[PDB]
Design a protein around this ligand. Sequence first.
Ligand SMILES: [Cl-]
Ligand SMILES: [Cl-]
Ligand SMILES: [Cl-]
Ligand SMILES: [Cl-]
Ligand SMILES: [Cl-]
Ligand SMILES: [Cl-]
Ligand SMILES: [Cu+2]
Ligand SMILES: [Cu+2]
Ligand SMILES: [Mg+2]
Lengths: 190, 190
Amino acid sequence: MNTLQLINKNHPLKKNQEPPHLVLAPFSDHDVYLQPEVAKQWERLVRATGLEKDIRLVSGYRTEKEQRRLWEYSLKENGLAYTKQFVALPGCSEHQIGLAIDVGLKKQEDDDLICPHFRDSAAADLFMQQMMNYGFILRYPEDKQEITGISYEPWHFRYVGLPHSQVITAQKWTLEEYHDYLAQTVRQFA
Amino acid sequence: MNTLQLINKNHPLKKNQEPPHLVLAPFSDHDVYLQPEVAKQWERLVRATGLEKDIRLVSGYRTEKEQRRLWEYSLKENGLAYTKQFVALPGCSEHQIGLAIDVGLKKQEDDDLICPHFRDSAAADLFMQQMMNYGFILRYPEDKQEITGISYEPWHFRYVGLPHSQVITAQKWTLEEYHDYLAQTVRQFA
Ligand SMILES: [Cl-]
Ligand SMILES: [Cl-]
Ligand SMILES: [Cl-]
Ligand SMILES: [Cl-]
Ligand SMILES: [Cl-]
Ligand SMILES: [Cl-]
Ligand SMILES: [Cu+2]
Ligand SMILES: [Cu+2]
Ligand SMILES: [Mg+2]
């Protein structure tokens, strides 16, 4: 239930953690599933930006087995080096808690894993202006690979909710940096 | 492993039946999973027809929960009448065995996600002329609603493999009629 939960290579998904409730998300060519609050905020964000005809939900919730099959597919498709840069290991993906979304342009053949498209597009620029106001952050920003362990991905967004998304974005932080900031702040009251 | 398995209202998926092996399917924005054999033939089909740019893979394998979320979304958004005609009940969908695909055109706006636009195109016409040569049948043909329990779905295709797909298509049969045909045929040898 913790919308701030940190999931990466060093902090894998809890095996004792209960699977989140999921609903079918709107504005998607495929059947994408997300947590209710995330799906609702995603819909509000699209309608508020007027991007119903320009952006689409490419990916959402993925099970550990689906994340594994994705990783294996990328391995044969793009190699080990590229896969490790853009695809998280099974159990270390925030897609597995239904808080992560992959966004792509409405017109497109290839997803940004193949031939990057979303970056610096008209739809992206307007999306980047309001996304933090609806609980979303850019999960893997540019020049942050050292901290996140993942290369720059302008199409991957993470729901953390308000006002966390506004705070993180304004400081140009990552979720890792946000947790370190929170950890340090708590120790001041100790 | 039984590509001819009949799944409908009258013949629900056994709850103790193990899920099929699954791989990520191409031409699906890295989001749709299918039976390995199905994904292979799906790839060979779209490659031979040269529709890589024209058509997309909307949906494939869906768990019972995912089928439920799909049903509940449709009911809330489109109403009961619409949902009955085009959405199979949870536990009675052939998407749950990874042999069913929902195909849509990359070439059109909007969603109509439950009934993807796949009819008025020349790409659709070409698809309908070669699909049976790669193991696929049109699962819910026109004027077959009384037999299938599902309205006309030009977007939904079922993998049965060769030569079953050719036999069924040539006779313009449904999977239900095919099973009745096999049943009557076997009893001639009794
Ligand atoms: Cl699964
Ligand atoms: Cl390699
Ligand atoms: Cl860390
Ligand atoms: Cl598997
Ligand atoms: Cl009909
Ligand atoms: Cl029957
Ligand atoms: Cu992602
Ligand atoms: Cu279907
Ligand atoms: Mg799934």
